[PDB]
Motif scaffolding. Structure first.
Motif, short mmCIF file in Angstrom:
data_model
loop_
_atom_site.label_atom_id
_atom_site.label_comp_id
_atom_site.label_asym_id
_atom_site.label_seq_id
_atom_site.Cartn_x
_atom_site.Cartn_y
_atom_site.Cartn_z
N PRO A 166 42.06 38.71 42.34
CA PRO A 166 42.01 40.16 42.29
C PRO A 166 41.45 40.71 43.59
N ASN A 167 41.79 41.96 43.79
CA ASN A 167 41.29 42.71 44.91
C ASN A 167 40.38 43.76 44.34
N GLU A 168 39.72 44.49 45.26
CA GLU A 168 38.64 45.35 44.96
C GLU A 168 39.38 46.42 44.20
N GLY A 169 38.76 47.03 43.17
CA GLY A 169 39.46 47.88 42.19
C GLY A 169 40.45 47.26 41.19
N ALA A 170 40.85 45.98 41.33
CA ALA A 170 41.66 45.35 40.23
C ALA A 170 41.02 45.47 38.85
N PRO A 191 38.68 41.96 23.47
CA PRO A 191 38.73 41.44 24.82
C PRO A 191 37.77 42.19 25.74
N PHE A 192 37.56 41.61 26.91
CA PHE A 192 36.62 42.16 27.82
C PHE A 192 37.38 42.33 29.09
N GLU A 193 37.38 43.55 29.63
CA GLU A 193 38.06 43.79 30.81
C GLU A 193 37.11 44.70 31.64
N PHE A 194 37.14 44.56 32.94
CA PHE A 194 36.43 45.50 33.79
C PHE A 194 37.21 45.73 35.06
N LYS A 195 36.87 46.78 35.75
CA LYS A 195 37.44 46.95 37.09
C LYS A 195 36.49 46.38 38.08
N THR A 196 36.98 45.69 39.08
CA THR A 196 36.18 44.99 40.06
C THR A 196 35.81 45.89 41.18
N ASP A 197 34.65 45.59 41.76
CA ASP A 197 34.11 46.36 42.87
C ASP A 197 33.77 47.79 42.55
N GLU A 198 33.05 47.97 41.47
CA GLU A 198 32.61 49.26 41.00
C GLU A 198 31.28 49.11 40.41
N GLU A 199 30.63 47.94 40.61
CA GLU A 199 29.42 47.65 39.80
C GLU A 199 29.65 47.83 38.32
N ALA A 200 30.83 47.39 37.82
CA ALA A 200 31.09 47.42 36.31
C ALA A 200 30.33 46.28 35.59
N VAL A 201 29.93 45.26 36.38
CA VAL A 201 29.19 44.10 35.85
C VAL A 201 28.13 43.72 36.85
N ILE A 202 27.15 42.88 36.49
CA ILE A 202 26.19 42.34 37.47
C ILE A 202 26.95 41.92 38.75
N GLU A 203 26.30 42.01 39.89
CA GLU A 203 26.97 41.81 41.17
C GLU A 203 27.54 40.41 41.32
N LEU A 250 28.83 38.27 39.18
CA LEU A 250 30.10 38.18 38.46
C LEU A 250 31.26 39.04 39.13
N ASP A 251 30.90 40.24 39.59
CA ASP A 251 31.86 41.01 40.39
C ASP A 251 32.37 40.26 41.64
N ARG A 252 31.46 39.70 42.42
CA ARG A 252 31.88 38.97 43.57
C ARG A 252 32.60 37.69 43.10
N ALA A 253 32.11 37.03 42.10
CA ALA A 253 32.89 35.78 41.73
C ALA A 253 34.32 36.05 41.36
N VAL A 254 34.58 36.98 40.53
CA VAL A 254 35.90 37.16 40.01
C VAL A 254 36.88 37.61 41.09
N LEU A 255 36.37 38.29 42.13
CA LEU A 255 37.20 38.70 43.34
C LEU A 255 37.70 37.42 44.02
N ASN A 256 37.08 36.27 43.72
CA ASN A 256 37.44 35.02 44.44
C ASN A 256 38.04 34.00 43.56
N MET A 257 38.58 34.47 42.47
CA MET A 257 39.06 33.64 41.43
C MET A 257 40.57 33.84 41.27
N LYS A 258 41.30 32.80 40.88
CA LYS A 258 42.73 32.88 40.53
C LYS A 258 42.96 33.00 39.03
N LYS A 259 44.17 33.42 38.63
CA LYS A 259 44.53 33.57 37.23
C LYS A 259 44.37 32.20 36.52
#
Length: 301
Positions: free
Chosen positions: A205-209, A235-247, A249-258
């Motif tokens: 994902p990219n920032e805002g995904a 289900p649990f969904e958030f938008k990335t790079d918005e501080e929607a979750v602890i930092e 986890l936000d940075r991890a998921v930006l570096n993760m594949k499907k």
């Protein structure tokens, strides 16, 4: 003099031949003559070398020997070649078996499977160094000198201990079984992301995904404090790079594949910070937290 008749022996490899057995190529080991053409030979191959004498040479096999510290400090002898092409890296958690001996074949330490983070080491300096050059499933024998063994202090017998005499050399069977890739995340590198299950092709994902994830959070003694987005929950969904979750986890998921499953190690400045989080257990202030994360799917920005 010369020769007529995919891989090749290198300088110093342990070659086995029929002629008309079995030496270190190109050291002091044969009449300084015919060594110097075995190194263009292939495995099955059958050459006739002509010296101004003839030699029908069948190169049978070899085992490579590597001066990995560039020191003669550790010579790595590959007794089974491993798979593919990656070697694990400092932050990697590797899983290995080894048996460490004195020169006289005395077993001092041994293991049938043990994991360690490569930069933390294990056993002695030689192990971390050897594995950083090894492929998956590579099996080696390492000839280790004192500075990469236990030095001057050597090592006392404790259990399952062999005393290593101050200034002894060591002979170590080592097998690199497998590993899990840790990436260091943040400007900082303070956030560790350990891949458990690799995801599928390239995209992240990219920032805002908007990201769908399953997460499990634990304290370092393994207590679960959080579960979210698992199949038996909404289900649990958030938008990335918005501080929607602890930092972290936000940075991890930006570096993760499907489909990627990761263990994410998050210092408190990237997690819950200095106040408590009352969840399944309480997150005590100043906790590093480990987050199991599954990146279920996502829609890029």
């Amino acid at each position: 003099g010369e020769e007529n008749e995919w891989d090749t022996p290198e300088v110093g490899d342990e070659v086995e031949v029929h002629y008309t057995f079995k030496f270190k190529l190109g050291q002091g080991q044969v009449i300084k003559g015919w060594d110097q053409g075995i190194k263009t030979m292939k495995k099955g191959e059958n050459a006739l070398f002509t010296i101004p004498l003839q030699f029908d040479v069948e190169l049978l096999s070899w085992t490579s020997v590597r001066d990995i510290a560039k020191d003669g400090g550790i010579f790595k002898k590959i007794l089974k070649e491993g798979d593919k092409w990656e070697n694990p890296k400092d932050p990697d958690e590797v899983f290995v078996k080894y048996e460490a001996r004195l020169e006289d074949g005395t077993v001092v330490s041994k293991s049938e499977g043990v994991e360690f983070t490569v930069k933390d080491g294990h056993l002695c300096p030689a192990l971390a160094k050897a594995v950083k050059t090894m492929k998956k499933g590579e099996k080696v024998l390492l000839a280790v000198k004192p500075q990469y063994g236990f030095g001057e202090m050597g090592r006392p017998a404790a259990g399952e201990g062999g005393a290593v005499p101050p200034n002894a050399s060591l002979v170590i069977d080592l097998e690199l079984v497998s590993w899990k890739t840790v990436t260091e995340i943040g400007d900082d590198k303070k956030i560790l992301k350990k891949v458990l299950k690799e995801x599928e092709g390239y995209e992240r994902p990219n920032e805002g995904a908007v990201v769908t994830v399953k997460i499990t959070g634990k304290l370092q003694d393994g207590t679960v404090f959080l579960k979210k987005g698992h199949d038996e929950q909404e289900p649990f969904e958030f938008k990335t790079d918005e501080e929607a979750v602890i930092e972290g986890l936000d940075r991890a998921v930006l570096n993760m594949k499907k489909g990627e499953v990761a263990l994410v190690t998050i210092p408190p400045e990237y997690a819950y910070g200095s106040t408590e989080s009352k969840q399944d257990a309480i997150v005590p202030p100043n906790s590093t937290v480990i987050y199991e994360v599954e990146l279920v799917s996502f829609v890029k920005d």
